[PDB]
Amino acid sequence: ENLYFQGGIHFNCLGMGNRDFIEGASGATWVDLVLEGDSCLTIMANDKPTLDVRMINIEASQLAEVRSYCYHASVTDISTVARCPTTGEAHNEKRADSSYVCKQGFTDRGWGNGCGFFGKGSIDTCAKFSCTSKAIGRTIQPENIKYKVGIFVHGTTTSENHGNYSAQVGASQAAKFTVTPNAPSVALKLGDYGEVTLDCEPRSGLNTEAFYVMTVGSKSFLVHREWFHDLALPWTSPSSTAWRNRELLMEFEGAHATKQSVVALGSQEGGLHHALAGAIVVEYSSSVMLTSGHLKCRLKMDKLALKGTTYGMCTEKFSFAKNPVDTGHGTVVIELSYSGSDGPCKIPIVSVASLNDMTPVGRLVTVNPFVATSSANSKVLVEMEPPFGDSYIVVGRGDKQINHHWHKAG
Structure with missing residues (x-):
């Protein structure tokens, strides 16, 4: 890859607000580490070059839809069929069109509005529902998670290039590697310094059955699952492609004689963002979601040389x-x-x-x-x-x- 013409990354410690120093036992073959996503470790060991290790981010891919919720609906083509008292229930023919939402009711009828009898005439009112904008909730499977971890050996640097990733890779003094649940231990060479092994336990820092990834408009969030199940919004799922509970975004207003208006609620997006005010935000622009967290590892250094x-x-x-x-x-x-x-x-x-x-x-x-x-x-x-x-x-x-x-x- 052409790192020289890609964006930089935070891969070492100098200048960062959060920094922890770790002292490895003299002679020890391993040092135990927890990489925290907003932080950076400097590891120092006797007869070893100093290292920076830091988590760059966590990526999830191939997330599966569990349910979609309409938050903004359009309501069009309203009609009402009405009947006189004693003549039984009105039935609007749009009951045969799965795109329409219909509701029965009653209105006052009599001689004055076309009925021979005085009383409650049945009405049936339908309107075409379409979803203009929907939020989507998804699951992550642990096998589809990647931890990107940066490492830096304190070799020769300058004030100008110390934090520049393409310069330090150029010097054989930095690297970035991927640990996954299926491949949780990785060895990399560090130029003239030998190699290290990162032997991690990614599954221990994962709770993928605890949440959904929910996209709302331009933002995505990690949300509590039962909160997601009880949203009062129309919904679909992969196993149920038609919108159910479409009435939640509709207001059938007061009917007079033979007419009744139906309107759509406005968008519910802002209400959703409000409810999610304290939820974990994640980056979910592409097919890949990016977040942050913890990763426990053992860093092996018996092959790390001066x-x-x-x-x-x-x-x-x-x-x-x-x-x-x-x-x-x-x-x-x-x-x-x-x-x-x-x-x-x-x-x-x-x-x-x-x-x-x-x-x-x-x-x-x-x-x-x-x-x-x-x-x-x-x-x-x-x-x-x-x-x-x-x-x-x-x-x-x-x-x-x-x-x-x-x-x-x-």
Whole structure:
């Protein structure tokens, strides 16, 4: 696919409002995760590159109609047949046309309006019903659900490309894969970092017998099933193609002598949206429905390796392309510019408590940061967790070395 000319996706964590950090046991082969749809996980493990994993969305396909409800009807071609008192029931011939809704009644008759006898004359009034606009309720089967999950390895990035999916796939540093009930475990390679396996239990986060997907006009919703069954609207189903309870959208008004008007209610769409005010909204424009939720998984990392743990250290001078800023997640991010051209090469960077005391404090989130190109003045983003209080970010070695002060409150 041409990702370079497709829309971006949220596939990693920096900049997102909701972010959780996960620390995997040192040496452990697996880490247990719950992907929540509005959030993002950063996974850090000793001797492992750092990962972002996040659910992108949940898709359902091939949904089956259960019932359709008319919410806006047209009512046309009204007629009334009437009879005199004592002559029995009126029968309008449109009773033979399944498209018509008919109702019997009575009107006052006498000499004055054409009857030899005084009393109640039978009338029968029919009108053609058609559905102008209908809402549709559908079921999802679990086999037709797909979870799209993004993964990102904290390799070399820049402030410009860090969140760009086509750039990180280009760098072999991101990927997007699909777990389903029938295929709930997936292995993918991550460039020079080996592979991971996502071993998930999709069925545990599914409740497809609890709801219907209901489309109303331009919106679709997840609705409680019994609420859907008791809607007071005309309906059809696959096993019952003709509209039943069509009178619900019709008003047979007061009859006089031999005439009676029948009108349609206005659209019931707005009433429906009102009733659905607090219901889950889902995207259901195409044949595919998109929603969000939870997915429990185990992330396997025994085949996940460090990359370039054998490059040489960068030898030339760095500078701060962007001075450190708090990410809002308890971490600090910088962007470095590297003047050298021996790249790719490892960035010497540490937090120390003072320049007297060059003892490493804190730690990197972008573990093993590296310049990835021989181009001079390239950029590398580095995310880190300094300690509380005063420390200095120290980049490079010797007298090439630069530092920036930082203070973390608390």
